[PDB]
Design a protein around this ligand. Structure first.
Ligand SMILES: NC(=O)c1ccc[n+]([C@@H]2O[C@H](COP(=O)([O-])OP(=O)(O)OC[C@H]3O[C@@H](n4cnc5c(N)ncnc54)[C@H](O)[C@@H]3O)[C@@H](O)[C@H]2O)c1
Length: 255
């Protein structure tokens, strides 16, 4: 079935062991850094939300262990705050993660400058497109930081986000390494609980579909037809976001 097909593609499991998944992600990050020694930093945008809070904690753990085990003091986890103009949740998240370094880059100026350039070209952006434009400016800032600190950009994408394609293409979807990929929303909460994360940091989505509906679907459970159809629709519609640019050799799009 299509549901079983999606579950397999995203690597989702019905249930997981929190401790095991935490270690899987941490050792994944550690192993990558050990394989490419020229990498000295992990860069991640912090928003105060569940996903980035979890990913941030895992990145700092990976760095903490590597520094102790290798004695390499040049390794660092860099948390980046990317506000659009003008924090409590972000501040609480930062206190929980305890990142080596915190940078704050206000993206408003660049976004306004981009729109002025487009306006002079005769193009006026809608609030909707502006939202994706902001996500791409955030991607730009993180890659510029990575470029100057010999780092890689960590992403927060996971199964509950990938299934609907609810991320900006080459925006927050533009990252180098995604340690949360495979986990659904509630499973992310499970890991945060095991990490003793402040409860208020992790506790609808669209067309009457909630995260519980999405997680149940990903866990192989039976959900209402209306819900299942909406989910599967979003998935098929956004396949282009989960693959590299389309070439004459691809056939996944042919109907
Ligand atoms: N109802 C909801 O809750 C809902 C629904 C949809 C999107 N969103 C949100 O909106 C943002 C995503 O917006 P979006 O996906 O339009 O913008 P996007 O930039 O992520 O994707 C749109 C771009 O992808 C390319 N594209 C579109 N269709 C294509 C196709 N069939 N083949 C190849 N390329 C194609 C085009 O360049 C198009 O401009 C996210 O924040 C997402 O969460 C929310």
């Amino acid at each position: 079935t299509l549901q079983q097909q999606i579950i397999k593609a995203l690597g989702a499991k019905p249930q997981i062991n929190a401790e095991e998944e935490i270690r899987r992600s941490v050792d994944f990050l550690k192993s990558y850094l050990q394989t490419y020694p020229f990498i000295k930093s992990l860069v991640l945008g912090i928003s105060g939300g569940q996903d980035s809070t979890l990913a941030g904690k895992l990145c700092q753990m990976a760095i903490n262990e590597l520094r102790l085990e290798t004695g390499n003091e040049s390794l660092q986890f860099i948390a980046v705050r990317l506000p659009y103009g003008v924090e409590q949740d972000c501040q609480d998240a930062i206190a929980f993660i305890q990142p080596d370094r915190v940078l704050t880059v206000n993206i408003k100026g660049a976004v306004l400058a981009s729109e002025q350039a487009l306006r002079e070209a005769g193009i006026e952006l809608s609030d909707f497109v502006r939202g994706n434009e902001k996500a791409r400016e955030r991607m730009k800032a993180q890659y510029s930081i990575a470029g100057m600190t010999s780092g890689v950009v960590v992403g927060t994408d996971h199964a509950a986000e990938a299934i609907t394609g609810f991320f900006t293409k080459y925006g927050d979807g533009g990252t180098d390494i995604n340690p949360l990929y495979r986990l659904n929303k509630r499973q992310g909460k499970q890991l945060l609980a095991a990490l003793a994360c402040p409860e208020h940091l992790y506790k609808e989505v669209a067309l009457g579909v909630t995260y519980d509906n999405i997680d149940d679907y990903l866990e192989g459970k039976n959900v209402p037809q209306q819900v299942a159809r909406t989910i599967e629709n979003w998935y098929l519609k956004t396949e282009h976001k989960r693959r590299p640019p389309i070439t004459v050799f691809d056939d996944f799009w042919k109907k």
